[PDB]
């Protein structure tokens, strides 16, 4: 018999993104080639099958630095990290291939699905 | 020119609640009288003006245990902690007074608003 506040989840994600922008309570650095991205492990896990697996590992759960596969493009990762914290995906003709490849590696099934759809249309 | 995934924020919150239920990456214990509640500091901050203030404090940000005011009712806190992680509020005749008082203390303005509305109706 609960009541529900429709905007609650969006407001929570908006505040988590504000914490990220201000580097508050970030607990991991994701290294992608020469580029570094600070984030919250819980948000990464909630969005990505790969980070979910990494941070549930009894040894990796305690690492403050995670290095991605050298094939991963820093821009594709940046676009996906922004999507994790906002629900908004900056999908463009010039980045769609790198975004799909990065989403497949990160195991972000809904992003992979829209990339496959957008590629099929063109 | 971003696209948006409508269910993303709700799915993120659902996964954060799954992490809470399994006690994964929880980093704080909230003590309410004899009762203890494990949670993620970032989620508490995203939902509550009080936890936002506590965990942005340069000394309190590093505490693993937070003791609430002894007037705070453990059931009212439990109902609010569930709301933080689900958007669902178990508001009942028998708990509404304790829920409003706890939401006022935690600085959860939308919960305070619905409690004031529900009390006014009766």
């Amino acid at each position: 018999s609960c009541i529900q506040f429709t905007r609650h989840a969006s407001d929570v994600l908006l505040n988590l993104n504000r914490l990220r922008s201000r580097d508050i309570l970030t607990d991991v650095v994701i290294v992608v080639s020469r580029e570094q991205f600070r984030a919250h492990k819980t948000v990464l896990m909630a969005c990505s099958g790969l980070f979910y697996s990494i941070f549930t590992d009894q040894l990796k759960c305690n690492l403050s630095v995670i290095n991605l596969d050298p094939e991963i493009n820093p821009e594709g990762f940046c676009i996906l990290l922004d999507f994790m914290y906002t629900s908004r995906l900056n999908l463009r003709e010039g980045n769609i291939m790198a975004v799909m490849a990065t989403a497949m590696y990160l195991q972000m099934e809904h992003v992979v699905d829209t990339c496959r759809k957008f590629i099929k249309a063109s | 020119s971003c696209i948006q995934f409508t269910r993303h924020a709700s799915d993120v919150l659902l996964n954060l609640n799954r992490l809470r239920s399994r006690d994964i990456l929880t980093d704080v214990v909230i003590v309410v009288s004899r009762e203890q509640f494990r949670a993620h500091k970032t989620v508490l901050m995203a939902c509550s003006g009080l936890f936002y203030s506590i965990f942005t404090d340069q000394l309190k940000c590093n505490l693993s245990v937070i003791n609430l005011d002894p007037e705070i009712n453990p059931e009212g806190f439990c109902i609010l902690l569930d709301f933080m992680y689900t958007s669902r509020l178990n508001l009942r005749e028998g708990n509404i007074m304790a829920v409003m008082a706890t939401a006022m203390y935690l600085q959860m303005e939308h919960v305070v608003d619905t409690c004031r509305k529900f009390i006014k109706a009766s």
Partner: peptide
């Protein structure tokens, strides 16, 4: 607020 809604009835979910």
């Amino acid at each position: 607020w809604v009835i979910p």
